[PDB]
Design brief:
- Chain B: This is 26S proteasome regulatory subunit 4.
- Chain B: It is a lipid-anchor.
- This is part of a larger assembly, with chains A (636 residues) and B (317 residues).
- Chain A is mainly alpha-helical and 636 residues long.
- Chain A contains 39 helices and no strands.
- Chain A has helices spanning 3-17, 25-28, 37-60, 65-81, 84-90, 96-104, 110-126, 130-146, 150-160, 163-175, 179-189, 192-204, 210-214, 225-231, 237-242, 251-260, 275-278, 281-293, 299-306, 315-328, 336-340, 353-365, 369-374, 376-381, 386-399, 410-417, 428-439, 448-455, 460-472, 481-489, 497-503, 505-508, 526-535, 543-552, 558-570, 578-587, 590-603, 607-616, 626-629.
- In chain A, helix 16 runs parallel beside helix 18.
- The longest helix of chain A is centred in the N-terminal third of the chain and has 24 residues, at 37-60.
- Chain B has helices spanning 83-93, 124-130, 146-149, 157-167, 186-201, 244-252, 265-268, 277-292, 300-316, and strands at 16-23, 29-32, 57-60, 114-115, 173-176, 210-213, 233-234.
- The longest helix of chain B is centred in the last third of the chain and has 17 residues, at 300-316.
- Classes of the chains: A mainly alpha (636), B alpha/beta (317).
- Chain A binds chain B through residues 543, 574-575, and chain B through 97-98, 100, 138, 171.
C-alpha cells in the first residue's frame, strides 16, 4: 500500500552504501511527498549529490519534466539552505541556468553576484565553453539590469559589445546620478564598434546633449590631462641627461623617442631648432610626429603647433605633420580633407608618406566605408614601399576590429587576391595577415578560420597568413584541444609559424597567467625563448617574470638582447633603474642601446593595446619600420 | 655532432677531480690537489671562466691536465610584546635596497646589520623577527654554522660560496640563526669564524647584502666579534613573562577551534617555561590527535593527554 516508504528506504540504503544510477530512480518514480537535521541529511547532501548525478546522467545520456521538477525542487531547496557557491557550482552543467538564476536572484545580490559571477565567470572564461558564456552574458544582463552595480554590466558590454546595453545603462545611469570618471572608463571599456554605434544612436537622441558632449572625444582625457600636470611633477634631469647622452645618429632617434614619449614640462620640445633637421628621414617622421604625440589635448593648440610643419619645404615634415594631426586627436577628423584629397599620385609622390601618416593616424582616429573606398586604389596600387599597405591593412583592420562575427567581404577578399597577386616582398605576407586577423577579431561563431583553411591553403607565405588567422581566431575559450594542438604543431620545421602561432600563447591564456610560463625556454630554439620573452607580457611584473628576465637578459644575439628591454620595461611600469644599470654592464650594439634607453622611457580584451605590439613583432628589419616604432598606440 | 662528441678522449678513462687555485689572464689556470700539483694549460670549451669563482674543485685528468670542463658542487605584525623591537628590525634591515627616498639622501650605508639573540632561542621567535625580510626579497637564510661543522674541514670556502651566491643575489638579507660555533676540528672553528668575521666586515666588499646574526645568547660572541661584528645596532630581548606566550598562543588559537575551557598558564608554563616551540608541537599533534577523534573541538583531556607526551619526552631522557 505505502510503497513510497519502501522506495524511500531502498534509495536510502542504496544511496547509503553505494550506487551510481540506482539512487535517483526511486525518487523519480516515488513522486516525493510526506531547516531540520534530517531534512538537511536526506535533502542537502543526499539530494545535492542525488540531483547532481541525476542531472549529470540525464544531461550526458539524453539530450523530460522529471529532471525539471527535481532540479527546480533542488533550486528552491538550496534557496532555503542558502549555500550558493557549492550548490550552484554543482548545478552549473545542467535556458535552464537563466530561469534558475532569475529564479534565485531575488534578495541575495552580493553573494550570488560577487561569488557566483566571480568564480563562475572566472571558471566560465577558463573552462566553460562560449555558448554557455553567452547565457552568462544574457542572464547576467537580466539580473544585473534589474539590480545595481552598473560597472559590471559595463563589463558585460565589454564582452557583449551591444548598443542596447550601453543605451539602457545610459538611461539608467542618467536616471540614477563620478561623471568624468565613468566617461573615462566608459570610453576605455567600449571598443571600436559600440562607440560609433553609440555615437550614432546618441547622435540620434542622447536626451541631454551630454552623451554627444562626453562620449565623442576630449572627455576621456579632460579629467586626466590637467590633473596629471598638477598631481605629478617630473624633473629636468631626464631632459638634460637623457637629452645629453645621445649621439651616434641612433641615440638621436632615441631622443626623438624622448621628445615623443617623454610625458608636464615642454623644454626639450622647444630646445631651439635644427634638431629635426639633423635627424634622418624616419627620424624626421618620428620627430615630426613627436609634437603630435605630446599634444593629445588642446585641439586649438595642436593646430597652431603642427601648422608650422604643415606644407613645409620637406616631404617628411608635412607627412609626419599629418601623422601628428592623426595622433593629436581621435574624434576631430577635420584634418582629413587636406591629405585625403591629394592622395591620388600612385607612384612616388609625397602622398605616399602622407598616406602613411594620414592613413595610419586616420586609422587611429577611426570604421567608415568612404575611407575604405578611398583606400581601394591604395590596396590596388601595391607600391614598392611596404608601410603603405602596412598602415593601410593595419588601418582598415583597426577600423574593422570587433565586427559582428567578422566578415568575408571584398575588403579582405580584395586584399587576399591582391596579396596573392605578386609573390614578392614577403613583408606584405607578414603585415597583411595582421590586418586580416584584425578583421577576424570580434567573432563569436564565425567559420572564417575554416574558410581560410579552404581558400588560403597554399605555400607557406599565405599558409603563414592562415596560421596568423589561426592566431587571431583563438582569442580565448575552453578549447584545450588548441593547447594539445599547440604542443603538437609547436615542433614545426617552419621557424616563423612557431613564432606567431606559438606567440599566440600570451593572448589565448592571457587572463590565467599561471599557465603561461612553461618549459619553452629549455629548448635550443632560441626563437622560442623569444616567444616566452614576449609571453611575459605587460602585467604587474612579479618576481617570477623578472626572474625570467634575469636569464633572458643575458644573450649575445641583438634580436634577444634587443627583444628583452621592451617586455622588461612594459612589464614594469632601487628596482627600476637597477636592471638598466645591468644593461649598462652588459653593453658598456646600437640596437640594444636605443632599445635600452627607449626602455628607460618605456618604463616612464582591448584591441588598442593588443594590436601595436603584435604588429610590432616584425622589428627585425631595416630602419623603415623605426618610423612606425615610436607611434604605437598601446601606450596609455 | 662529431665536434661535440670528439672531445670524449680527454673526459674518458683518464679523468680526475682536482681543486683549482686561481685563473691567470694568460689563459692558463693553476690547479692543486692533496699534494698540491700545479699544472697550467690553455683553457678549452665548456667552461665559463667568469662565474666559476676560482678557488673551488674542478675536473682534472691523468693527461697534461688540459681543462676540459668544470663541475659545480607569522608576519611582522602578528606577534605581540615586541612591536617596538620588530619595527626596530623592520625599520633597520628594511632600510637598504627598500624605501630608497630616505636611504640615499642620508648617505650612511652601514653594511653590518643587527645582531639578534634570545634566551629561549629555538629559531621560532628569532625567525619571527627575521620574517620581516620575507615580504619583498629573495629567500636566503644560512641557519648557523651547522653545515660548516658537519662537513670536512674545507674551511671558509663554503662561506665564500654563500658570499658569492649572496653577491649574485644582492636583493637579499643573509640571516644566521642558532650560532653554535663556539657554544657547542675544534681549532678550525676559530679560524673559520675569524675569516667569517673578516669577510663579514667587508674586507673586499661594500653595502651589497645585510647580515643578521641570531643565537641563543649574546655572550656567546667572543670579544673579537664585537667591534668588527657589531657597528650598526644591537638589540635586547626581555623575558616573555606570559605576554609573548599569550600573543603566540593567541596566534595558535586564531586558526584552531577551541573555547576558553583550556587552561593557559599551566600549559605555557608547564615544565619550566616555553613560548612557541613545544606548544606549537602540541598544537600540531593536537590538531592531528584531535582529528583522530573525528571532532574539530579540542577536548580538555586530549590536549593535556597529548601534552603528556612532550612533558614526558624531555624529562625521561
Amino acid at each position: 500500500l505505502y510503497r513510497p516508504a519502501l522506495e524511500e528506504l531502498r534509495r536510502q540504503i542504496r544511496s547509503s552504501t553505494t550506487s551510481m544510477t540506482s539512487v535517483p530512480k526511486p525518487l523519480k518514480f516515488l513522486r516525493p511527498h510526506y531547516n531540520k537535521r534530517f531534512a538537511a541529511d536526506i535533502i542537502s547532501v543526499l539530494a545535492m549529490t542525488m540531483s547532481g548525478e541525476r542531472e549529470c546522467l540525464k544531461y550526458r545520456l539524453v539530450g523530460a519534466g522529471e529532471v525539471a521538477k527535481e532540479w527546480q525542487e533542488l533550486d528552491d531547496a538550496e534557496k532555503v539552505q542558502r549555500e550558493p557557491l557549492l550548490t550552484l557550482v554543482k548545478e552549473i552543467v545542467p535556458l535552464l541556468m537563466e530561469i534558475e538564476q532569475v529564479d534565485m536572484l531575488e534578495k541575495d545580490i552580493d553573494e550570488n553576484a560577487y561569488a557566483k559571477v566571480c568564480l563562475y565567470l572566472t571558471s566560465c572564461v577558463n573552462y566553460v565553453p562560449e555558448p554557455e558564456n553567452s547565457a552568462l552574458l544574457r542572464c547576467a544582463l537580466g539580473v544585473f539590469r534589474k539590480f545595481s552595480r552598473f560597472p559590471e554590466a559595463l563589463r558585460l558590454a565589454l564582452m557583449l559589445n551591444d548598443m542596447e546595453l550601453v543605451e539602457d545603462i545610459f538611461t539608467s545611469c542618467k536616471d540614477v546620478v563620478m561623471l568624468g570618471r565613468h566617461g573615462v572608463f566608459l570610453e576605455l571599456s567600449e571598443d571600436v564598434e559600440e562607440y560609433e554605434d553609440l555615437t550614432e544612436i546618441m547622435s540620434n537622441v542622447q536626451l541631454n546633449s551630454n552623451f554627444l558632449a562626453l562620449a565623442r572625444e576630449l572627455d576621456i582625457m579632460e579629467p586626466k590631462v590637467p590633473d596629471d600636470i598638477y598631481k605629478t611633477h617630473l624633473e629636468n634631469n631626464r631632459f638634460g641627461g637623457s637629452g645629453s647622452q645621445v649621439d651616434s645618429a641612433r641615440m638621436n632617434l632615441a631622443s626623438s623617442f624622448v621628445n615623443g614619449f617623454v610625458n608636464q614640462d615642454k623644454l626639450l620640445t622647444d630646445d631651439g631648432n635644427k634638431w629635426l633637421y639633423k635627424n634622418k628621414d624616419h627620424g624626421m617622421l618620428s620627430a615630426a610626429a613627436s609634437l603630435g604625440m605630446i599634444l593629445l589635448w588642446d585641439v586649438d593648440g595642436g593646430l597652431t603647433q603642427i601648422d608650422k610643419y604643415l606644407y613645409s619645404s620637406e616631404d617628411y615634415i608635412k607627412s609626419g605633420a599629418l601623422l601628428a594631426c592623426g595622433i593629436v586627436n581621435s574624434g576631430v577628423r577635420n584634418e582629413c580633407d587636406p591629405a585625403l584629397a591629394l592622395l591620388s599620385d600612385y607612384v612616388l609622390h609625397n602622398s605616399n608618406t602622407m598616406r602613411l601618416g594620414s592613413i595610419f593616424g586616420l586609422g587611429l582616429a577611426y570604421n567608415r566605408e568612404d575611407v575604405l573606398t578611398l583606400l581601394l586604389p591604395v590596396m590596388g596600387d601595391s607600391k614598392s614601399s611596404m608601410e603603405v599597405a602596412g598602415v593601410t591593412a593595419l588601418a582598415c583592420g583597426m577600423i574593422a576590429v570587433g565586427s559582428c562575427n567578422g566578415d568575408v567581404t571584398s575588403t579582405i577578399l580584395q586584399t587576399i587576391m591582391e596579396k596573392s597577386e605578386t609573390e614578392l616582398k614577403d613583408t606584405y605576407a607578414r603585415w597583411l595577415p595582421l590586418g586580416l586577423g584584425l578583421n577576424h577579431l570580434g567573432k563569436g561563431e564565425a567559420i572564417e578560420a575554416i574558410l581560410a583553411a579552404l581558400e588560403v591553403v597554399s605555400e607557406p607565405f599565405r599558409s603563414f597568413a592562415n596560421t596568423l588567422v589561426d592566431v587571431c581566431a583563438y582569442a580565448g575559450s575552453g578549447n584545450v584541444l588548441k593547447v594539445q594542438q599547440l604542443l603538437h604543431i609547436c615542433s614545426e620545421h617552419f621557424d616563423s609559424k612557431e613564432k606567431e602561432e606559438d606567440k599566440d600563447k600570451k593572448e589565448k591564456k592571457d587572463k590565467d597567467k599561471k599557465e603561461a610560463p612553461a618549459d619553452m625556454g629549455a629548448h635550443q630554439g632560441v626563437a622560442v625563448l623569444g616567444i616566452a620573452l614576449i609571453a611575459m607580457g605587460e602585467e604587474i611584473g612579479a618576481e617570477m617574470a623578472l626572474r625570467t628576465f634575469g636569464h633572458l637578459l643575458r644573450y649575445g644575439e641583438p634580436t634577444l638582447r634587443r627583444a628583452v628591454p621592451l617586455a622588461l620595461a612594459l612589464i614594469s611600469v632601487s628596482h627600476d633603474a637597477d636592471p638598466e644599470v645591468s644593461y649598462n654592464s652588459i653593453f658598456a650594439a646600437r640596437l640594444a642601446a636605443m632599445l635600452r634607453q627607449l626602455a628607460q622611457y618605456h618604463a616612464k580584451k582591448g584591441t588598442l593595446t593588443l594590436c601595436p605590439y603584435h604588429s610590432d613583432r616584425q622589428l627585425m628589419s631595416q630602419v623603415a619600420v623605426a618610423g612606425l616604432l615610436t607611434v604605437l598606440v598601446s601606450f596609455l | 655532432e662529431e665536434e661535440r662528441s670528439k672531445v670524449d678522449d680527454l673526459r674518458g678513462t683518464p679523468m680526475s677531480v682536482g681543486t683549482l687555485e686561481e685563473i691567470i689572464d694568460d689563459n692558463h689556470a693553476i690547479v692543486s690537489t692533496s699534494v698540491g700539483s700545479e699544472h697550467y694549460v690553455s683553457i678549452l670549451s665548456f667552461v665559463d671562466k667568469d662565474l666559476l669563482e676560482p678557488g673551488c674543485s674542478v675536473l682534472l685528468n691523468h693527461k697534461v691536465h688540459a681543462v676540459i670542463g668544470v663541475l659545480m658542487d607569522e608576519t611582522y605584525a602578528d606577534i605581540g610584546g615586541l612591536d617596538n623591537q620588530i619595527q626596530e628590525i623592520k625599520e633597520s634591515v628594511e632600510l637598504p635596497l627598500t624605501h630608497p627616498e630616505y636611504y640615499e639622501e642620508m648617505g650612511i650605508k652601514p653594511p653590518k646589520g643587527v645582531i639578534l639573540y634570545g634566551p629561549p632561542g629555538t629559531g621560532k621567535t628569532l625567525l619571527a623577527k627575521a620574517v620581516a625580510n620575507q615580504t619583498s626579497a629573495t629567500f636566503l637564510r644560512v641557519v648557523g654554522s651547522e653545515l660548516i661543522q658537519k662537513y670536512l674541514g674545507d674551511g671558509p670556502k663554503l662561506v665564500r660560496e654563500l658570499f658569492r651566491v649572496a653577491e649574485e643575489h644582492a636583493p637579499s638579507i643573509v640571516f644566521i640563526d642558532e650560532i653554535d660555533a663556539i657554544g657547542t676540528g675544534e681549532r678550525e672553528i676559530q679560524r673559520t669564524m675569524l675569516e667569517l668575521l673578516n669577510q663579514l666586515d667587508g674586507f673586499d666588499s661594500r653595502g651589497d647584502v645585510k647580515v643578521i646574526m641570531a643565537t641563543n645568547r649574546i655572550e656567546t660572541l667572543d670579544p673579537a666579534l664585537i667591534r668588527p661584528g657589531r657597528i650598526d645596532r644591537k638589540i635586547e630581548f626581555p623575558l616573555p613573562d606570559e605576554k609573548t606566550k599569550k600573543r603566540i598562543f593567541q596566534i595558535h588559537t586564531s586558526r584552531m577551534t577551541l573555547a576558553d575551557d583550556v587552561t593557559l598558564d599551566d600549559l605555557i608554563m608547564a615544565k619550566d617555561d616555553l613560548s612557541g616551540a613545544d606548544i606549537k608541537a602540541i598544537c600540531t599533534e593536537a590538531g592531528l590527535m584531535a582529528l583522530r577523534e573525528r571532532r574539530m573541538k579540542v577536548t580538555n583531556e586530549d590536549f593535556k593527554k597529548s601534552k603528556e607526551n612532550v612533558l614526558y619526552k624531555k624529562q625521561e631522557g
